[PDB]
Write a protein that binds this ligand. Structure first.
Ligand SMILES: OC[C@H]1O[C@H](O[C@H]2[C@H](O)[C@@H](O)[C@@H](O[C@H]3[C@H](O)[C@@H](O)[C@H](O)O[C@@H]3CO)O[C@@H]2CO)[C@H](O)[C@@H](O)[C@@H]1O
Length: 383
């Protein structure tokens, strides 16, 4: 057998290790060995290994990071193998995810999945508060007022859970708010962005969300929602399968609230891409693995609660009512997602935003001053 290595942050209930077991059962002359990483080490460990000369054959890399690796020669050019494939067809992919694997008019990967965030809410807690569980918040003012009402320290319930962590988590969570208010990462200090950050400050200052929001991932924040300790959660479709097992209450999912009713929804394009490292000894076999993964995209939502990056396979209902309402909301919200980049410098853009968020939420800087500084940094690093 040819033995390949594959690195991903996917855990046991997530696609990669399960796809790998199915691939290995084919006994097709190829075997894959898996390494499970943490979010915060996918880039660092990946780039260390490539620099050291022992990168894996395959990685699942977060879409905003793809351009850095591709621009640096770390990823194999898969343009010609994609052209020969009928399993992997560029026509199948949503434009944004496909663009994220491209660099200099060549393909340097294949999208794995796509996502964005939306608003989960605990319908039982809504009802108990005298709110209308059929009419979740539509505006930021409604969201904040609901969060005030639903904050119940007597039962250690926060009105909302989210993430402002000083890494990609916080940037991915903030950009929708800023974008809905008219800003972009290229123009992050508009008055609307300032209002977004002031609104985050309210959620924390008024103890409507945990102080741990500043240091905790979306995944770990949502676990508190599942446990009944946050009435609402801003997170992605990757929560669904775990939520169905863990949340012991009735829940719904709605579009992200907007700053005023005349503002359209907007968010950041989430999820990962497959890539092959450029010095693989086994390019054909690694590509065949990726083809096998793509051939199973049709079953990703039913098996894992994640969404394919593809227009050719619209996701069918599962038959689970909670899961299917989640699907409907996320499929809609996804249409309004915007890419982070392309930029080989994405981490520096994101750090500027992260620093603004931390500075304002701590009270050390005003939102305006924090974001003005981020915008200055971004002018430099995004040039
Ligand atoms: O943080 C910004 C990124 O948010 C989204 O990433 C998701 C992952 O897609 C998802 O798999 C999940 O990752 C967790 C992983 O499943 C788990 O085993 C582990 O212990 O922690 C991982 C990190 O939490 O959750 C993260 C969000 O926390 C989005 O897909 C990505 O594009 C964003 O950049």
């Amino acid at each position: 057998d040819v033995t390949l290595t594959l690195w991903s942050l996917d855990r046991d209930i997530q696609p990669a290790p399960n796809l790998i077991k199915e691939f290995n059962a084919l006994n097709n002359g190829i075997k894959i060995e898996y390494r499970q990483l943490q979010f915060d080490d996918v880039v660092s460990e990946s780039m260390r290994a490539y620099s050291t000369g022992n990168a894996p054959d395959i990685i699942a890399i977060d879409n905003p990071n793809h351009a850095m690796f591709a621009s640096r020669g770390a990823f194999l050019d898969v343009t010609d193998m994609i052209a020969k494939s009928d399993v992997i067809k560029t026509e199948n992919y949503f434009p944004g995810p496909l663009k994220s694997v491209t660099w200099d008019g060549k393909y340097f990967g294949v999208p794995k999945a796509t996502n964005t965030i939306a608003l989960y809410y605990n319908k039982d807690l809504f009802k108990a508060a005298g709110l209308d569980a059929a009419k979740p918040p539509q505006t930021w003012d409604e969201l904040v007022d609901a969060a005030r009402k639903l904050t119940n320290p007597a039962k250690n319930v926060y009105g909302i859970s989210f993430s402002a962590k000083a890494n990609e988590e916080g940037t991915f969570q903030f950009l929708p708010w800023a974008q809905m208010a008219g800003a972009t990462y290229k123009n992050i200090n508009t008055d609307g962005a300032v209002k977004a950050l002031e609104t985050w400050k309210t959620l924390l200052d008024e103890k409507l969300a945990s102080p741990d929001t500043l240091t905790r991932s979306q995944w770990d924040s949502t676990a508190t929602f599942n446990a009944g300790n946050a009435a609402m959660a801003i997170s992605g479709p990757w929560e669904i399968d775990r939520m169905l097992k863990d949340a012991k209450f009735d829940w719904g999912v709605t579009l992200l609230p907007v700053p005023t009713p005349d503002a359209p929804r907007s968010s950041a394009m989430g999820d990962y891409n497959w890539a092959i490292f450029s010095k693989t000894k086994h390019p054909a076999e690694a590509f065949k693995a990726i083809e096998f993964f793509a051939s199973k995209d049709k079953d990703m939502f039913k098996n894992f609660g994640q969404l394919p990056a593809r227009s050719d396979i619209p996701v069918p209902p599962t038959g689970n009512a909670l899961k299917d309402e989640a699907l409907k909301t996320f499929v809609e919200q996804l249409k309004y997602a915007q890419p982070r980049g392309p930029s080989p410098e994405w981490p520096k853009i994101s750090k500027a935003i992260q620093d603004a968020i931390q500075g304002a939420l701590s009270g050390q800087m005003t939102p305006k001053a924090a974001l003005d500084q981020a915008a200055e940094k971004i002018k430099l690093v995004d040039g």
